[PDB]
Design a binder for this molecule. Structure first.
Ligand SMILES: [C]N1C(C(F)(F)F)=NN2=[C@@]1([S])[O-]2
Ligand SMILES: *C1(C(F)(F)F)=NN=C([S])N1(*)[C]
Ligand SMILES: [Cl-]
Ligand SMILES: [Zn+2]
Ligand SMILES: [Zn+2]
Ligand SMILES: [Zn+2]
Length: 233
């Protein structure tokens, strides 16, 4: 396993990891309350351009992300999708926009970002408003599994590569306790995860919002952690 961790990534830097032909994750680090967290997004080749999924958690990181993509891949990022409204997913949208990247999110995400005072993707993704809804967006399928980590969270599937990117609705195996769930729907989260399993049973690579990739085993792991948190006392 050659996936990078926080020790191999000074804050302000970004690593790319090739998961499959024409599919990468981008990995960045960010500090919070004296601890350092890794964070994942996705990059998907579409012909001679690139689709970006999520920012690198801030303006500085996201600029570094664009510089690393150009250095290592050398194809233009034409579109970006943010998978929910929190700052680690839309933080850096203004940088993308300034660089000429068309930015996208569901209308639900755009609204919530606005309420939070966060950066707001330009474009609104139709067809994702009800749990179980999917739309094609270039080389990926976008799926709204229902509320989980947030009410607006999306997941992304790359059918050519069998790569499922769960964003912050899916926990890495090393995470044994609930993360930040201030905006979560704990009641619905397991149900939302099971929709993901039902829709992508053939997924071979599962990328959590933070940390190490794995397989579909990450879904039940996440459900277990969420349910234990639910019963907390
Ligand atoms: C990490 N995270 C966040 C912040 F804001 F803190 F950054 N949000 N959500 C999560 S997971 O996403
Ligand atoms: C763009 C482009 F062309 F990719 F830059 N900007 N807004 C929309 S919609 N598109 C396709
Ligand atoms: Cl645009
Ligand atoms: Zn979040
Ligand atoms: Zn546009
Ligand atoms: Zn996150």
């Amino acid at each position: 396993g050659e996936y990078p961790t926080v020790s191999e990534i000074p804050v302000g830097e970004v690593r790319l990891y090739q998961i499959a032909d024409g599919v990468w994750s981008h990995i960045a680090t960010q500090s919070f309350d004296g601890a350092v967290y890794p964070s994942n997004g996705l990059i998907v080749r579409d012909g001679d351009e690139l689709l970006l999924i999520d920012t690198a958690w801030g303006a500085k990181n996201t600029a570094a992300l664009l510089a690393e993509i150009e250095k290592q891949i050398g194809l233009p990022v034409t579109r970006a999708v943010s998978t929910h409204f929190h700052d680690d997913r839309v933080g850096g949208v203004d940088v993308l926009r300034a660089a000429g990247v068309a930015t996208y999110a569901s209308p639900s995400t755009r609204r919530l970002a606005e309420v939070e005072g966060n950066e707001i993707p330009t474009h609104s993704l139709e067809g994702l408003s009800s749990s179980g809804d999917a739309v094609r967006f270039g080389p990926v399928e976008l799926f709204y599994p229902g509320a989980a980590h947030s009410t607006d969270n999306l997941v992304v599937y790359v059918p050519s590569a069998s790569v499922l990117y769960g964003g912050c609705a899916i926990y890495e195996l090393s995470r044994t306790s609930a993360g930040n769930v201030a905006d979560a729907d704990l009641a619905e989260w397991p149900t939302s995860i099971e929709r993901i399993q039902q829709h992508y049973p053939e997924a071979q690579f599962v990328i959590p919002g933070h940390g190490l990739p794995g397989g579909l085993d990450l879904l039940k792991h996440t459900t277990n952690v969420v349910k234990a948190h639910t019963n907390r006392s």
